[PDB]
Structure formats: C-alpha cells, structure tokens
Write an enzyme that holds these catalytic residues in place. Structure first.
Site, PDB file in Angstrom:
ATOM      1  N   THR B 155      49.406 -67.662 -84.357  1.00 14.66           N
ATOM      2  CA  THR B 155      48.071 -67.564 -83.513  1.00 14.66           C
ATOM      3  C   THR B 155      47.542 -68.874 -83.143  1.00 14.66           C
ATOM      4  OG1 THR B 155      47.732 -65.428 -84.081  1.00 14.66           O
ATOM      5  CG2 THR B 155      46.030 -66.507 -83.584  1.00 14.66           C
ATOM      6  N   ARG B 183      52.657 -53.054 -82.215  1.00 14.20           N
ATOM      7  CA  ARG B 183      52.086 -53.816 -83.248  1.00 14.20           C
ATOM      8  C   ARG B 183      50.967 -54.726 -82.631  1.00 14.20           C
ATOM      9  NH1 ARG B 183      50.712 -59.231 -85.249  1.00 14.20           N
ATOM     10  NH2 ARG B 183      50.228 -58.995 -87.485  1.00 14.20           N
ATOM     11  N   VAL B 184      49.584 -54.370 -82.995  1.00 15.73           N
ATOM     12  CA  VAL B 184      48.517 -55.213 -82.454  1.00 15.73           C
ATOM     13  C   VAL B 184      47.993 -55.932 -83.634  1.00 15.73           C
ATOM     14  CG1 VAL B 184      46.207 -54.810 -81.602  1.00 15.73           C
ATOM     15  CG2 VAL B 184      47.958 -53.667 -80.774  1.00 15.73           C
ATOM     16  N   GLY B 185      47.679 -57.111 -83.573  1.00  9.38           N
ATOM     17  CA  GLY B 185      47.231 -57.995 -84.642  1.00  9.38           C
ATOM     18  C   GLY B 185      45.732 -58.307 -84.701  1.00  9.38           C
ATOM     19  N   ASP B 186      45.191 -59.310 -85.281  1.00  9.65           N
ATOM     20  CA  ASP B 186      43.795 -59.384 -85.193  1.00  9.65           C
ATOM     21  C   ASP B 186      43.317 -60.055 -84.088  1.00  9.65           C
ATOM     22  OD1 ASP B 186      45.411 -61.833 -86.248  1.00  9.65           O
ATOM     23  OD2 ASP B 186      43.368 -62.578 -86.598  1.00  9.65           O
ATOM     24  N   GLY B 207      46.370 -66.761 -89.235  1.00 13.75           N
ATOM     25  CA  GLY B 207      47.047 -66.344 -90.631  1.00 13.75           C
ATOM     26  C   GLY B 207      47.905 -65.117 -90.836  1.00 13.75           C
ATOM     27  N   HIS B 208      47.801 -64.301 -91.868  1.00 12.83           N
ATOM     28  CA  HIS B 208      48.212 -63.007 -91.683  1.00 12.83           C
ATOM     29  C   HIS B 208      47.257 -61.860 -91.041  1.00 12.83           C
ATOM     30  CE1 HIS B 208      49.281 -59.322 -94.336  1.00 12.83           C
ATOM     31  NE2 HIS B 208      50.066 -59.290 -93.376  1.00 12.83           N
ATOM     32  N   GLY B 209      48.001 -61.599 -89.954  1.00  5.36           N
ATOM     33  CA  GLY B 209      47.028 -60.723 -89.031  1.00  5.36           C
ATOM     34  C   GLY B 209      46.504 -59.444 -89.534  1.00  5.36           C
TER      35      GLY B 209
END
Ligand code: NA
Ligand code: NA
Lengths: 293, 293
Positions: B155, B183-186, B207-209
């Site tokens: 990101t 898959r939808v992240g942050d 970072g980690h979504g």
C-alpha cells in the site's frame, strides 16, 4: 458472569401502514426472540447476532436478503458484516447477489479465510466453494421492490449482543438504497462505520444514510465516547448529533456496553427496534415491555 | 495561510538491495514532489494527494496501479480511497480491474456520483461511463510479481495540508500477495486506510490490511490527537495498540491541522518522504533534510 442481552433494529421508514407497523414489529420481536434463544442456551455473542440478522434477512419485510431493494439495473446487491469483540475478528461482504444470507457468508469469511472482506464476483466464488446455495434473485426481489424502483426515477438491519461470558458482537446486513448505482457500497461492510465490537468497550450497529455513517465512522465514534466515560446514552446522542450537524445525516444506533448497559436512539423520524433482557422483550418513545414465553 | 505540507509512504518489503532501494527512494521523492508542486500553484490538498498517489501507481516499483502484487488467480484487482477534511467527502473503489489509476476513480466516485464507495462491476461500469481507458490486463502485470506469486504458490498513500487550512488523504494498493479473489483490504475502508478531517488532521496507513481494518487505525490515531497527544505520540499509541491487540505491524503518516507531521512505523521498513518549506525529508532513522531539488 453476566446476563445476556440482544438488541436489534432496522432503518426507519418514516410514516407507514398500520399492518406494516404491525408486521415490522413482529419481525423485530422474532429477531430478538431468535437471538436471545441462542444466548439463553449458552450460545456466543456472535451466534446470537448471526442468528438474529438471518431472521431479518429471510423476512420479506426487511431490506436485507429477501426484501432487499433493487439497484439501477433492477438487481439485488447486498452487503453485510459481523464482528467478534473478543479479538476483533470480523467478516464482511460487499456487492453480493443470489444468496439467501450474506450475514452467513460474512461469518465464513471471518472464520474460514485469513481475510475480513470479500466483494462481488469474488464473494460468489467463496460462496460456491463453501456450499452456499445459489438462488434466482427473483426470490429476493418483491413486486413492491419492483414498484418503488420505477417510481424512484420519477433501511438496513442490525444486531448487537452481550453473552453469558461478557463477550459482545454486532451483525449487520442490507440491500442498500433503491436505485443505487451498480456496485454501490454503504456502511454495513466497513468496520467501524456500520459496526464495531470490542470487549474493552462494547458493541454498536448503526442505521441511516450509509454515506453519512461511513464519513463519520459512526459506530467506532460511538464507542470513542464511552471510552471517555460518557454513559451509553450520552455517547449515542453525541455521535448522532455530530453526523447530523457535520454531514447533515440521520439514523439510529443500538449499543450494549461491556457491562450489559444498552440503549436504542435514532435522530430519524422513527426506528424499529426490540431488545431482549432478563426474560423480558423491550419494544419500540413508545418503548413497552412483555414476558418472554 | 498555512505553510503547505505533503507526505508520501509505501509499505515495507523488509530489507532490500541498493538496486531496489534507490528506485524506491526516487519514487518517494517524485510523488512527494508532484504533490508539493501542486500545492505550490496553491492547488488543493485533494489535488495533491491524488497526484502523489498517481505517481506511485505509475511507478512499477510500488504495489498499486502498475506493478501491483497478484491475487491467487494470477491477476491484479486494486483498492483506493480519497477523503477531504473540509466536509469529510469521500470516494473509494475496491477490486477494480485493468485500469491505470485507481485513485482517480475514487475521486471520480467522490465528485461525480451520489455515493462514496463502489466495487468490482459497478466501479467498472461507472468508470466506462467516465471514459476511463480499459487497459490490458498484462501491462499492469510485471514479471517480478509473477515470480512472487509463482514462489508463493509452491500500500501507498499521501496526506496533505493546503494553503487554505484543508487536509486530505489518498491511498492505493494491489493488495496482499496470493490474496483470494475479491479480497478487499483496508485501503477503501474510511477510518482504516486513511482518515482526513480539517478539524483534527489527516492520516495514512501501510501494513497488514486486515489488522489495520480491525483496529480502525487511521481514525484511532486521530482520536488521540483530538484528546491531545502529539502526532508522534498518537502514532506510537495507535500503532502500539495494533501490535498488542491484533498482533499486526505496520506504520503511518499523519499531518495535523497545526502543520506538525510525522512518519512512524513498527514493521521493518516504511519508505517515506515529506516536502515542506522548500525542503525534502526522508530517513530510515539521522533524519536528512536536503533543499528541494
Ligand atoms: Na429480509
Ligand atoms: Na505501481
């Protein structure tokens, strides 16, 4: 250990038919009944809200699953989320069609995938992969929903619960808004917006204009106000007044804090709700109480 | 009127050679220089964040637009959002496909629709009505990511203050390597991917979504700023809490309505830059301000 509770609600509809006041309250009270029958049995906070929104998805009166409103193509598009306040596990789906319970599909995302959010074409693939049936959408669409849509070119459902171990959760699902753009997404599937659950604070679900709810982070904000010692009611009124005066939005909230305290408050005309607590169903400020048989 | 500031960052990929590093360095400079430039014509923070972001998208070395990582099924599906602190208006897209510039489509969702968030097929029809060029699925595909998927199977963002007191954020990603389809992240969940509110500030997260989603970091960092932590302390605690509760590392950039800006991180790397006062700033620790070239 603690005494369970379930609150449920849906988006307010303004003025409505006498038999509709009637059928909505019946659908609410069934949702509460179903949720608390899971809690009274030792079910978790999550199972309670999963079961309680499945009730609201399956019932044609509610804009969620069967009864979901039609987009600008006349098709059902559906979002949902659920969240485990113990560890912040959550599952969400956006833009889904052809399944009975997205709230059930949102649960499988959380538990069965190392991800929190699937959408559209991709959500169908996991749906099929998980043995989730496939339906013709025509069984979600009502004639009433066909009607409303035509006339456009001239709300949500949710649940919160605190279970016997003090664990909280929220679940939320919706078909959105009549005539929305294909693949429009609102509050439901976005954590903190449509909902949020946390064992260090409490559990909120929200209804009302999705855009207004997401811009303000309306559920997390609600939980922020309890994080500075406001009571669950002072919080709720603080966050809804901010969405109203800051982005001109209205809607409703149901919250249960980590101690079992709860409220139902809405800045919209009305808001359908029922709660279940200490063997009593609370309905609704015409809130009135009965026994749980 | 305010001394304008723009900050850019990308997610870390742990330690890397010099051959990769200077590329990653130039990129942070270019996007931060594009954004600074725009604010020099006295343009908007919404304009600036957009441009910085577009530049990283076009730079194949970053995991957004061209050179996004791949999902499990061999392909690129992208996520993006944009927010304006003035009245919190937003636009976002998720799992958009075969286009060059996800962030612009977000802003198009902001400016030219009634909504704030569109996904997959609705985002695709929408963009086609905007005449966004549908571009080949394999120009977006680079050969280093092919290997990253092939190995694995066997990101970015910017925040901005303009010369009229506004704040804004934008973010962009191709997601996580080998992510389920859809898959939808942050990045499109306002409150997590970033947040901008002129009354408090703007923030962007890498970072980690899923973890970032769960703790709703962007809005989290700002809660503390409101309550009166410095930007440095807000990042330390917002990011503190992400590590303790959901065991996710990441990092952030943030700008205050007072013009104090910080970049902070828990991962190994976060390549970043900031351009304020005719200067460039960067640093793995020992911060290096050089006049702006
Ligand atoms: Na229903
Ligand atoms: Na790129």
């Amino acid at each position: 250990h603690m005494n369970p509770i379930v609150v449920v609600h849906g988006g307010g509809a303004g003025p409505i038919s006498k038999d509709r006041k009637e059928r909505v309250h019946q659908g609410m009270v069934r949702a509460a009944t179903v949720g608390y029958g899971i809690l009274r049995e030792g079910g978790s906070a999550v199972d309670a809200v999963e079961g309680a929104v499945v009730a609201l998805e399956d019932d044609p009166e509610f804009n969620a699953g069967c009864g979901s409103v039609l987009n600008t193509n006349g098709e059902v598009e559906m979002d949902a989320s659920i969240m485990d306040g113990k560890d912040l596990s959550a599952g969400a789906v956006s833009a889904v069609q052809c399944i009975a319970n997205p709230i059930k599909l949102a649960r499988l995302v959380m538990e069965k995938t190392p991800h929190c959010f699937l959408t559209d074409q991709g959500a169908a693939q996991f749906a099929a992969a998980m043995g989730v049936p496939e339906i013709p959408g025509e069984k979600l669409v009502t004639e009433r929903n066909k009607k409303r849509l035509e006339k456009e070119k001239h709300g949500t459902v949710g649940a919160v619960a605190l279970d016997c171990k003090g664990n909280v959760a929220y679940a939320t699902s919706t078909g959105g808004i009549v005539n929305k753009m294909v693949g429009r997404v609102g509050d439901s599937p976005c954590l903190g917006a449509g909902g949020y659950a946390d064992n260090d604070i409490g559990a909120v679900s929200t209804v009302g204009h999705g855009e207004s709810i997401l811009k303000v982070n309306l559920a997390r904000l609600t939980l922020f106000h309890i994080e500075q010692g406001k009571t669950v009611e002072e919080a709720a009124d603080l966050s809804l007044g901010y969405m109203k005066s800051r982005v001109k939005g209205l809607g409703g909230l149901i919250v249960v804090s980590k101690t079992g305290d709860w409220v139902a408050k809405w800045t919209s005309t009305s808001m359908p709700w029922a709660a279940a607590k200490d063997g009593k169903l609370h309905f609704g400020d015409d809130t009135t109480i009965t026994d749980l048989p």
